[PDB]
Every structure is written in structure tokens, then in C-alpha cells.
Ligand binder design. Structure first.
Ligand SMILES: O=P(O)(O)O[C@H]1[C@H](OP(=O)(O)O)[C@@H](OP(=O)(O)O)[C@H](OP(=O)(O)O)[C@@H](OP(=O)(O)O)[C@H]1OP(=O)(O)O
Lengths: 205, 205, 205, 205, 205, 205
């Protein structure tokens, strides 16, 4: 990553073993549950394209997902190249292409040079947006169940039903009342319209 | 978070993997037991709105609770907007709206700019107050038992009863004597009024 | 806590996740065994009143003990207010009351201001003394056995007996010879007076 | 490794116990699965030849692999010596030979001297390229199965098949359709040409 | 402890939770095996008397041992007071007594003042010598077996016997040949005098 | 150890609990497998003689080995004294003897003084060479099997045989073909001379 030292210049620091290990574990434990994406974003704070490639490449399973992600990255890179065509002056900074942003045709020195320029060309932030676009599609694809099949069981506590319902909506990126069991549905119908979630959960407790 | 370096300027630092992992674990282990709230407050010391959103978004379960929290945050944001209406001068700091404080319509650069201004606009401290308001309502809602149902068993040591009693009061946010078993109740009645808790526990040992 | 940086000014630092987790675990594992108190004192080195409240508030069980501690803290605060009455000049440091020292009516900024003043008002050290007074009473109360009931068994090695004896004395805050078994008691009587513990343990080995 | 301190000079730092332990574990757990190579590259960021030799030498098993790697390193060193022949001036920097780059005939002081020269001779980056060449050959050799033997089972979900297929291709460094089961193959044939992987996985879900 | 910062002044630093936890564990796992003493010495590098008392006081068991240690410390303190009698000038450093060195009648500020004086009065190093004197007596006392009872079994490999023999000598602070079994004893007698341990172990392999 | 701070002077730092614990564990887990030696060398980077003695003394078992090591160290120290005889000028640096290099008759202050002198007397590097000489003899002695007894089993995969073969050669510090089973031996004989290990392993797969 690129960090500010104790004296206030932006410098390159090695990715820590703690960071590397945290990412690999979360993917092992959680696969592409939606909460993996904000964890990815937090663990890659200040990342260079080189560091982002490290994090993706260190994943050993889920290789269908990692191929789908490469495809998304190649589409965003090709759209970058459409919007930002490029033409080198000795000693001067060249303009990045899509494949430079994705870290496949650029060196770590060029990446640092772009990211610490005045004004900077935030190649790490741009690449991370492409990656997250790709990861969101994977989360959606790996979602096991439609929101239409989340219905409250006859003996299921309302809180447990709402937890399943919002967990599914999150992964898929009045239905709550419609899919409630007969007993809660009655209670909820009687609350009247524009009830908060707190009020519905209180009523059905 | 925003920290002071070794040379005494306020600078942005990445959220640590240690911090991220501590929060996720405590929610996995403790759910919305009341002691989770002072842990949240301690783990988010110096946080930007971006960092607070990271911590909330990295929770994978309890999605009914996290929806209730979004609702509370939207109410506080709307009250902010009532009290502090806003109208940009090139290069100058804009005034934050509710959604800027909650980190949904502001960038990390704007958040740092507000929090390190002279004088600062403590957007992270303001947002954290809204979050804690929301978390306290959740703790109260998830409290399993009324204080009225905490009564000392015929064979239950007085200390164990008092522990259950104050654990429940804490989550719900002379009753102690009234709910004691016959044997302790006698002892306690005879101590006379304005006995300390130490004196009651000593007497019933 | 308040620490000296690498350049020698006293500055505020966030409580670490390592510190927070160490305290919670030691209370989970050891409850109010006497050795918990020197651990508390070591983990709270340089603490502000805010940090001390964090550490106490993050404990989830033992809520009878934490209520007894609040009582002790309120007594010490009221005695502070007796000895040090208070009357604000724009921009000037106000004098702390008992409730300021205990961190309930003071901000973190005021606490840092007191603790780093020339000369300082060590509000964190004062509060920590009150807490430790309260914790010692709890250790004493939770002591399972009287020293009078620690007697050496007919087959118990003398070393194991002495370990139980001094473990109990520590928690309760010639008896050793009197409570020894017949065989050691004989040996010990014959050593004559003013024998060291090393000499008694050697003799009874 | 060679790192920049807080004041911006390139200095030598000891390899951390965290780094050493991370590498040894990943080799214990993953052997020569392909994802071990990007982990090696990330854990050896800024490494001297001495540090790279440490990491290789601390591996206790897989000694057939570590002998094959020595062979590859000796070939690259001999090609270095072909391209860059060498001839010492008192106090002056000598030119490195292949065996200097691999750290067997150079001291740590010479290695730092080369790597921090203006302009630098990046002996650590050169050696790491040789090592990675050698590691890729080992990954290929230890690949258990040909891509030709990865075929979708009659009851195997398409996603699980694609995961095995791309895991194998990765280690070996229209076949996907040809090796699909009869049911998916039909669906896939009907999609028409130039379907993305996302579209094939959606269709076969 | 007292450490040098990044800028080269000697300053006080809080004892780390890592240090505190390492000590407590090693005593839990190893009791007073001899290797506990060099671990104590390494974990207390730069310690103040306050820090040394922390480390001793955080031990929960072995209270017979910790009482024996207090006795040894009181003897060394009384001998200090014999050799170095003391008589305060406003603002000036007082001379330490035995009980000041052991940290019972001195403040942390006085301890830092002594240890960082020019020239320094190394109260932490002096106290640590007293503690180690006391710990060595405990190791000796807790030694389970006399060296006279370490004899090689008829089926015991010579290496395993030598390991037990030197483990015992270490704790107790030609016998090796005399206590060998008949078969090795013959081999060893025939080697002739002034054989190294390597030669004896080779011969008996 | 002696490290460079953030400002570029060589200063003494305490051995870390992480370092201490890593060494003790690796000896517990691996005994004197050959890979323990490069781990020792990496964990003792920048060590003073005091730090090296700490690491050796913290090992609790293998006391026959640690006695053999003391013997080797005493031989190297006596050869040092032969090559470098010594004769003190008030305030001046004395010349080190063998026992000074091994840290038994020198203080930590003298050791730092030598190691940071201009030019330095690298007492830590010299002692570490003696230790490693001693450790290599121990690895050799504890090697369980002769290379002559490593032969490929009739059902043993060639890769597994080569792993055992090079693991043994490493500890002992055309035989490969001679000790192969009949089936591989045939294949290998037919490859012709000067085949690489990669080619032999490919052929026998
Ligand atoms: O790995 P160790 O040598 O035991 O030391 C570590 C380590 O910090 P260093 O990288 O400076 O060694 C940690 O880093 P990670 O391995 O987790 O990346 C860190 O944990 P944090 O990341 O949360 O800082 C930590 O400190 P903590 O005590 O807060 O766990 C600390 O251990 P000690 O400071 O106790 O020695």
C-alpha cells in the first residue's frame, strides 16, 4: 500500500502478513457472502494494483469466480481505453492504459509514480472499483435462494424470519408482511400503514 | 481512523485487520448483549464515517437488527437536516448534510477535511452517537426476560441471583429484596433500610 | 491512554484491541482471584477515566460485583467533593469534581487537559485508586474459604498445603504450623523458633 | 528486507518472525498448489538474497522440489554469467556474478550495497525472478490431473465442475463445453458462440 | 520498561500485554523448571521495580514459592541497607533504600529518576539480581530427583539417559559413566580418559 | 539485538516475546531437524552474545545436545584465544577474549560497545558462527538413518523416495539411481547420462 509515514510524505509499504492471512481466511470461511465485499475494501485500503492482484491471486479455490472476475476486469479496462486513448518523453510520466490500471502491463514503480503524482492518478482506487463491480456480480450469482421463497414458518419466531429475509435481499442486491405466517400477518395488518420495522418486530414478539 | 502521528499532526490511518477481526468476533460471540456497545465505542476510537460503515457492513448475520439501525440513522439524519440546513465556492469546504455525516454522500477526503478543520466539524463523533442510539434500542429489543421474572430460586445462592438481576436491568436499560427467596428476604428485611449491596450480599452469604 | 510519542510530548492514544481483549479474557478465566488486580493495574497503565470506564463496561458477567464497584466509586467521589469543593473563565481549565474524575460528567478533552497540565492533575491515577479499593473488597467477598479451614491432609504433601494456605491468605488480604498434619507438626516443632519458610519446606519434604 | 524508514532512507531490516512463520505454514498446508507462488512473492517483498535463501532453507519437507529449484537457480546463474562477465579497486563496489545474486558467494553488506546504490543493481528482484521460474516448474510437475480428465459428472453442479476445471488449468499453466455432461452441453450448444462464463453458469444453474 | 525512543532519549514505556501474557503462560506451563529463569530475565529487559513487581504479582498459583521469594528479597534489602545507609533537599534526588529498590516504598517517578540519572542508579538491575537469587533457590527446591538416582535403564538409549542426567544437574545447579548401564559402561571404559561427550554418545549409539 | 532506529543510529533493542516464543516452539516441534538451523540464524539477526545465550538457555529439553554445544563453544573460544591474545586505559575499550565473545565474562554494555565501534568488532556474528558449527554437529548426530538405507520401495512413488533421499542427505550433510526400485531403475538407465532431476522425476511419474 501507499501510506503516509510519521513525517507526512506518501510512501510505499509492503503488504503485511496479517493483511494477507486475514483475506485468505475470510474467503475460506465466508466464500461470497455479501459481507466479504466490505471486508475486501477495508483490507485493501491504500492498495496499489500490484497489491490488489496479490490479494486476488492468493485465493486457491473458487477459480470459476476468479475467471468471471477477470472477464469483468477486461470489460472495464476496454471501456477505460475507449474513454481515455493514449499515444515517451525521456524521464516523464506516461499515461496509463486499462491494462496498466489492472497492474498487468505496469511496474510497481510506475504505479507509485501515478498514485503519488501532483495531482495523482488514483490507479489503485480505479482498479478497486472494477474489482468490486465484479465481486458484486459474483455475490448475486452465488445467492442460494430467491426472496420469493423466504416465508415465515408456522413455528418460526418473527425475528428469525426477518433475519433470513434481509440476509437474502442483501445477497440478491409489503413483501415482508405478505411472506409472514398467518398469526403475525394478522397482527401486522392491524398495525396500519407506514409502521417501522421496530414496531412490526415488537408487535410480533 | 484519524490519529496523531509521532510529530503531532492529525492524519488518516487505515483501519487495522486486528480491529476489523475483533469487532466481527465480538458480534459472532455476544450478539447484542449490552457489553457489545462499550466494545464498539472502544474499537471505533478516532473513526471516520467510512470506518464506522465498514464496521457495521462487515457483520454478516443479524440483518433484521442492521435494518433497524439504518432506520434510526435515517431519523437522526433527517433531524440533523432540520436543525442545520445547507445551500460551492471553488476550493472551499462545503457544509455537511445528514447523509454526509452518515458517510453515504460524502468522500473520505471530505470527511478528513471536516474532522481536521480548525475548528473541526466532528462528523465521526456525531455519526457514532446516532449509531449508539440505534444499538441501545436493539439491545433493549433483544433482552430475553423482564426484570419482573428474575426471582431467586429456593436453592439459588444470593450472589448468583443478584448477578442475573443486574444483568437483566442492564439490558432493559426494593425490587431486589421483593424478588429474593423467603430465607434471604427475612434476613434482608431485618437489616433495616439504606443497606448497601455489599451488606445485603454479606448477610445472605 | 496518554503516552509519550518518539519526540517526547504527552499525547492521547486509542486503547488497543490487544489490551481490550486481554482484560475481557482474564476476567472470563480468573473472575476475582487476587491476581486479577495487578493485571488490571498493568493493562490500564497511562489510562484516562474514559479508558478505565471502557475496561469496566466491557465486562459482560459479574454484574453484582460491577454494581458494588459503582457504589465504592460513588463513596470515594463524595469524599473527594468534601475535601475539594469547586465554584468558568473563558478558555481556562475548570477544577474537577468527583464525577469528573470518574469520567461520568467530564469529556475526553477535559481529561487530557487535566492529565497533561503543568503541573498535571492526575485524574486517571486518582480514579484508578478508587477502582482498586473497590476491586479489593470484591476479591475479599468472593474468597471461598476461611484461613481457619485450610488444614493439611494426612496424605497431602507439605508444599501443596502451603500453596493453599498462602493462596487463601492472599484473597482474605504459627497458624501454618498449627494447621499442619501430625507428622509435619512434629518435625516443625523440633526446628525451634524463627525458622524461615524455606527451612520448614525442606524439613517436611 | 530493505525498507524505507519514517525519514525516507533505504535501510536493512531483520526478517520478522511473523513473515518466517507465515511462509513455513503456507508450504505445510498448501504444498505446491499454484496460489503458493503469489504468497511467496508477497511475503518476500523488499527481500535481500540472504532473506530469500532463509525462506527456502526453512522448509523442512519437499526436499526433491528444493533440489529441483537449486538446479533451475544454477542454470539462471550460468546464463547471467554468460551475459554479464566480470573482472578490486580499494573501497569500490565490485560487479555481481550469478552466485552473488543467488546469495552463496556474496555477504549481506555487499547485497545491501548493490540494492541501495544510485542507480541500484536489484539483486533481490533478479534472484526472486529465478526462484519463481523454478517454483512454476514445480507447480506444473506436482499438478495431479490433466485438463483432459476434468469432466462434469452426471450429478455434478456446473459451478463445481467449472471450479475443478479452472483449478486444473491454473496448475498446468470450447474444451469447457466439450467436457460438460449431456444436459448442460445441450443448454450450452443452444446459447450460441462467444457466450461469457457468467452467461454459461447462469444457463446451467 | 525504560527504552530508547527513535530519537535516542531513555523514556518510560508501559509493559505490553504480549509480555504480561507470555510470563503468566510460561509459569502455568513450566512451573519452576530451570529454563523459566532465563525467560524471566529476557521478558523483564529494561524493567523498573514496578514492572518486576507486576510480573511476580500476576502469578496466581505457586504462592508458597512467591512467599519464599519475598523472604529472599527482604534479606537482600536488609544487606543493601547495611552497606548503603541513607539520611530532603528541595527538588533533589534522594538516595534509595532496600525497600525503594524492591519498589514497595518508591514511586514510579522516583524509579525512572534513578534509572535515567547521569550517572544512573540501576535500581531495576539491582532488584532483578535479588529476584533471580530467590528464583534459583526455588528451582533447586522444586527439583524432583537427586542426580544420584539418574541411572541408565537396561533398554534405555544412551542419548535419552544423558538428556535426563543433564536436565537433573541443571535443576540441582565420571558420574555419567558410573550411572550408565553395563553394556555402555564397558564401551565407555574402553574409550580411555578425557573423551568428549560427542565421542561417548557416538560410541554408545 | 542491535538495530538501526528510524533516524539511522545503531541502538540496542530488547529481544521481543514473539522472537523468544518462536524459537522455543520450533525446537519443541522440530528438535534438530536440519531446517532448525536457518530458523535459528533468522531469529537471531542483529543478536548480541547476551541475546544468543538467552535463546540457547530458554530451551528446556535436549540437555545432552546443549552440553555438546557448550563443548564446541569452549573449543572455538580457546582457538580464538590462541590467535588473538590480549593484555585497562581509563575510559577505553578493552580487547575481547573468547569468553567475552561467548558472553560469559562480558557485560551487555561492553558487547554493544564492541558491536557499534568504528570499525566494529562483530562479537555477535563471531559467536553465532561458533554456535552454528556446534548445531551442525548435533544435526548430524541426531540424523536417524544412513543414506545407504534409503531405498525405493516396490510400491513407493518415485517422488516420495526422492523426498526421503534428499531429506537424509541434508541431515548427514548415481546413488539415487542405484537405490531406486527395479521398474524406475530400468527407466532411468535408459535416459542416458547427465539427466536433470526434473527429467528423472518426469520419466518415473
Ligand atoms: O507479531 P508479533 O511479533 O508478536 O507482534 C505484533 C504485531 O505487530 P508487529 O507487526 O509490530 O509485530 C501485530 O501485527 P499483526 O501480526 O496482527 O499484523 C500487532 O497486532 P495489531 O495488528 O493489532 O497491531 C501486535 O500488537 P497487539 O498487542 O495490539 O496485538 C504485536 O504484538 P505485541 O505488540 O503485543 O508484541
Amino acid at each position: 500500500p501507499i501510506v503516509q509515514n510519521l513525517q507526512g510524505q506518501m510512501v510505499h509499504q509492503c503488504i503485511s502478513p496479517r493483511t494477507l492471512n486475514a483475506w485468505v481466511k475470510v474467503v475460506e470461511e465466508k466464500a461470497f457472502s455479501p459481507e466479504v465485499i466490505p471486508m475486501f475494501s477495508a483490507l485493501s485500503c491504500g492498495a496499489t494494483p500490484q497489491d490488489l492482484n496479490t490479494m486476488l491471486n492468493t485465493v486457491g479455490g473458487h477459480q470459476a469466480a476468479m475467471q468471471m472476475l477477470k472477464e469483468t476486469i477486461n470489460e472495464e479496462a476496454a471501456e477505460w481505453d475507449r474513454l481515455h486513448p493514449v499515444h515517451i518523453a525521456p524521464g516523464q510520466m506516461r499515461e496509463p492504459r486499462g491494462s496498466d490500471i489492472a497492474g498487468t502491463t505496469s511496474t510497481l514503480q510506475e504505479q507509485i509514480g501515478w498514485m503519488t503524482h501532483n495531482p495523482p492518478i488514483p490507479v489503485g482506487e480505479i482498479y478497486k472499483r472494477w474489482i468490486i463491480l465484479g465481486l458484486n456480480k459474483i455475490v448475486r450469482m452465488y445467492s442460494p435462494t430467491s426472496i420469493l421463497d423466504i416465508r415465515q414458518g408456522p413455528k418460526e419466531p418473527f425475528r428469525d424470519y426477518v433475519d433470513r429475509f434481509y440476509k437474502t435481499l442483501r445477497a440478491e442486491q409489503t413483501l415482508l408482511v405478505q411472506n409472514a405466517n398467518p398469526d403475525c400477518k394478522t397482527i401486522l395488518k392491524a398495525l396500519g400503514p407506514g409502521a417501522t420495522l421496530e414496531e412490526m418486530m415488537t408487535a410480533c414478539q
